[PDB]
Amino acid sequence: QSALTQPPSASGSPGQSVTISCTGTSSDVGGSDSVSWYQQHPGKAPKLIIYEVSQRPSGVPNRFSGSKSGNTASLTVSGLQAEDDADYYCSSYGGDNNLFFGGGTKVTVLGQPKAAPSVTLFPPSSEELQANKATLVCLISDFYPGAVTVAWKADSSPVKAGVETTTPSKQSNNKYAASSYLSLTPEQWKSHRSYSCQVTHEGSTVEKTVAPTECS
Amino acid sequence: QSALTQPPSASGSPGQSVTISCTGTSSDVGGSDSVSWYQQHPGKAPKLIIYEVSQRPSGVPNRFSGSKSGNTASLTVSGLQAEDDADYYCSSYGGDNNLFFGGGTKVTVLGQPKAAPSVTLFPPSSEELQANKATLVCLISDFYPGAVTVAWKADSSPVKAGVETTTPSKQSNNKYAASSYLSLTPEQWKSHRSYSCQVTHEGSTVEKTVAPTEC
Ligand SMILES: CC(=O)c1ccn(S(=O)(=O)c2ccccc2)c1
């Protein structure tokens, strides 16, 4: 994980407000007035937009404001404009391990209607199992905005290793698709009660589960 | 407001060294030892590789070394590996709570090894078939460089409708992955002897075939 917790994505339409949060502990976010926020347009240098929870550097419009309540800092962007479409990171001093960062929130300025993802979960194919592979694929299509977070479970347990998710890409219908794949051994696949794919889009999570069958 | 100065690009072959510079002013880079370097893979959070000019955080290999002379910080990456191919940003605090960032250097690791796609074709899931859907997925992973073409067959005949292929994306092994998905009805899927996914990469084609289940 990242050391501070940010929600992976947030969205608004032009001229609306968005608040994104940054959660730590009493020793980092809640121990001082040291929260910073940074804005990054993809493939461009990031920029500091807030320091000391609330302070705007020269040239940052007052549409951006920062606040904090105990262990959670918040950035509010009022009057969303096209240029506000970017990734936002927070940071806190932690005293003991110096500077701690969140994992970034992708903020989308809605360019089209919101669309919830179609999630399909494929158990291992016969051919790959005869090749000693039990890779599962979680197909995620037809969503907007193009920001999705994928988690896998082995039974109820988070599974960390063997997960890859493709960078969502705009398809012919102008909505996004991605696939997540989990590279299991046939042993792992057959020996568990189930595997699940959990897909989070626009602050809402969808889950699909598959289990081994006698046949294919 | 002003960026720190980085060259837009640099490069090295595997095992070689690259050195990249970050030029500020006497009031930022030249004014204290608060220079940081970050590594960023496109579409991912950055990783801190150096803080306070020279210091590697936990888990950053000793291949990454940071120095400063006057107003210019330098990062040297030695024994270059595919994973080092990335954008590198420098930062420096100045006066008045200012934080300055470089424009970023894209470091290319030259001559990365060609890799043929692993192709896995999945017939419709039980769940989607119960929901009156028969989408097939052709998973395409572990290929390099990141350009593939995908054609589908229904029995031996070209499929001209219903195909989406995602734009290849670099995964954590530094090789490309994509999925092709064919949106069939349960009727289309069951009315054919098989469906085939043909993946073309660097003039070479891999074909996989699936058929309605007998279970
Ligand atoms: C984990 C870590 O150290 C992080 C996370 C965000 N940032 S940054 O906002 O200074 C940034 C630096 C370089 C490129 C993009 C953003 C640093």
Q: Most A CBs within 10 Å: which of B179, B194, B207, B213, as the mutation test of the A interface? A: B179
Which of A76, A109, A142 is where one domain is finished?
Answer: A109
Whole-number Å distance between alpha carbons of A101 and A130: 44
Tell whether A42 is within 8 A of chain B (Cβ).
yes
Under a CB-based contact definition with an 8 Å cutoff, are residues B89 and B101 in contact?
yes
Q: Does a structural domain hold residue A216?
A: no
- B105 and B74 housed in the same domain: yes
Nearest CB neighbour to B125, from listed A103, A121, A169: A121
- B13 and B105 housed in the same domain: yes
- B15 and B101 housed in the same domain: yes
Nearest chain A residue to B208 by CA distance is: A127
Whole-number Å distance between alpha carbons of A39 and B53: 23
Q: Does a structural domain hold residue A4?
A: no
Mind giving me the DSSP string for chain B? -PPBB--SEEEE-TT--EEEEEE--TTTTTTSS-EEEEEE-TTS--EEEEBTTTBPPTT--TTEEEEEETTEEEEEE-S--GGG-EEEEEEEE-STT-EEEB--EEEEE-SPPPBPPEEEEEPPPHHHHHTT-EEEEEEEEEEBSS--EEEEEETTEEP-SSEEEPPPEE-TTSSEEEEEEEEE-HHHHHTSS-EEEEEEETTEEEEEEE-----
- A77 and A135 housed in the same domain: no
Q: Where in the sequence is the domain holding A149, given as residue range(s)?
A: 118-210
Look up residue A69 and give its amino acid.
Answer: S
Q: Does a structural domain hold residue A215?
A: no
Mind giving me the DSSP string for A99-156? EEE---EEEEE-SS--BPPEEEEEPPPHHHHHTT---EEEEEEEEBSS--EEEEEETT
Domain of residue A174, CATH code? 2.60.40.10
Whole-number Å distance between alpha carbons of B134 and B136: 6
Q: Does a structural domain hold residue B54?
A: yes
Nearest to B119 by CA among B188, B184, B165: B165
Q: Tell me how close the Cα of A157 comes to any Cα of chain B, in angstroms.
A: 22
Q: Does a structural domain hold residue A1?
A: no
Q: What three-state secondary structure class fits A189?
A: helix
Residue B14 has which token pair? 């595997």
Q: How many residues does chain B have?
A: 215
Nearest chain A residue to B8 by CA distance is: A44
Which of B109, B135, B157 is where one domain is finished?
Answer: B109
Q: Tell me how close the Cα of A69 comes to any Cα of chain B, in angstroms.
A: 23
Pocket of ligand 1, candidates A89, A92, A97: which has the most ligand atoms within 8 Å of its Cβ, to mutate? A89
Cα angle for residues B151, B125, A169 (degrees, 5° grid):
50
| CB spacing of B181 vs A215 below 8 angstroms | no
- A99 and A132 housed in the same domain: no
- A54 and A104 housed in the same domain: yes
> Which of ligand 1's atoms lies nearest the C-alpha of A2?
1
Whole-number Å distance between alpha carbons of A204 and A183: 26
Q: A107 has which bridge partners? A: A10, A86
- A127 and A202 housed in the same domain: yes
| CB spacing of A51 vs B97 below 8 angstroms | yes
Q: Does a structural domain hold residue A50?
A: yes
Q: Three-state SS across B119-135?
A: EEEECCCHHHHHCCCEE
- Helix, strand, coil shares, percent, chain A, to 5: 5, 45, 45
Q: Does a structural domain hold residue A60?
A: yes
Q: Tell me how close the Cα of A140 comes to any Cα of chain B, in angstroms.
A: 10
- A124 and A87 housed in the same domain: no
Cβ neighbours, 10 Å, residue B15: 10
Whole-number Å distance between alpha carbons of A43 and A23: 26
Q: In what order do the strands lie in the sheet with A72-77?
A: A18-23, A72-77, A64-69
CA dihedral B54, B60, B62, B64 (to 10 degrees): -60
Scan for tokens 């936990």, then name that residue: B58
Q: Does a structural domain hold residue B203?
A: yes
- Beta-carbon-side half-sphere exposure of residue B101 (alpha carbons within 13 Å): 17
Number of domains chain B contains: 2
Which of A66, A88, A109 is where one domain is finished?
Answer: A109
DSSP A214: S
Task: Name every residue whose Cβ is closer than 8 Å to that of residue A52 and which is 6 or more positions away in sequence.
Answer: A33, A34, A35, A36, B97
Tell whether B133 is within 8 A of chain A (Cβ).
yes
Tell whether B141 is within 8 A of chain A (Cβ).
yes
- B192 and B158 housed in the same domain: yes
Ligand 1 neighbourhood includes B59 CB (under 6 angstroms)? no
Q: Are strands A9-12 and A105-109 parallel, antiparallel or unpaired?
A: parallel
Q: A47 has which bridge partners? A: A39
- A177 and A141 housed in the same domain: yes
Whole-number Å distance between alpha carbons of A193 and B93: 53
